Subunit: 130 residues, 3 copies
């Protein structure tokens, strides 16, 4: 099976720790998936960050066990003239273990940054065998 969740905005937040991106959540157990592998793609094509010291955003794919994979974008100037849109994609292939019932997207601030999604973003998964 294939799974998909998409949003067209998220509340603007800051957080020093990972917080859920609302709506980017896949219920793997509800899909009847209890083993095998899932290729998970977190696609945030048009984010930006605001801040005062090389802003950016750390993104994660998380399961019941916590963060399984992470990454980030950051700007290359201390205070960008304009905080441009920085497409971001993270792929992680995970084993659906007895204890994996969901996958979700999360994010946290780089250097105090406020985190912005104001258009399409998605979390997708395709199941397969090893």
């Amino acid at each position: 099976p294939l799974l998909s969740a998409s949003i067209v905005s998220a509340p603007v937040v800051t957080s020093e720790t990972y917080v859920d991106i609302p709506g980017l959540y896949l219920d793997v157990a509800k899909a009847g998936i209890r083993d095998g592998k899932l290729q998970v793609i977190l696609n945030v094509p048009t984010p930006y960050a605001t801040g005062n010291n090389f802003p950016g955003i750390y993104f994660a794919i998380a399961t019941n066990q916590g963060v399984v994979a992470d990454g980030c974008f950051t700007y290359s100037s201390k205070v960008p003239e304009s905080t441009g849109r920085m497409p971001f994609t993270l792929v992680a292939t995970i084993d659906v273990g007895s204890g994996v019932t969901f996958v979700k997207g999360q994010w946290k601030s780089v250097r105090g940054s406020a985190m912005h999604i104001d258009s399409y973003a998605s979390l997708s998964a395709i199941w397969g065998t090893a």
Copy 2:
């Protein structure tokens, strides 16, 4: 089944509204797919934009029914010292049973920018289904 289209260049264009990226289309009808879902990825790993006011490019996945998903990159300086390469990927899942006959990659300008692809880019799809519910 897997579907793929790829290109290694496109003409430089400026367009206020969405226009096809030449070569990036999947003829779903000809493939003989009339049900289930496609996970579609538009991958433009090395584009750049030129312009006068924080240049950038919007990209979209469209079907015969319209635009399904879109996004953009933009630079962080008004007139960048050099317009660097800004990898872009867009992922959407579409229901072929709704009447879908094709999938296309499209683009349009941010703030009047000219749009540049001069190397590999792709539009890909993997067929599958939602798991049944009881």
Copy 3:
């Protein structure tokens, strides 16, 4: 089948020519992949490049038969104030049963840049039939 390989670090290198990113390797032959196609995704979400002339990195997906797709990121300043993280993804679809034995991720320098991965990156592939 779904093949995948991931890393959380790689040695820093500088190279004019494509070199393998260690650990980003799929052994298609050993998998005994039925004839068909593989959709391959190379995802390097948090790289950076260091250099003094508009730095960047080229990435490629390669099989035993050669490079099948490549691209790059580059910065927009000659000497970036800081070299920020520049997410990169590359997607290509290859044939199985016509001589492909492996798929790998490779990279090479833009303008003499040193190449940096210090966190999660992956190469994955999903099999299917042709149209």
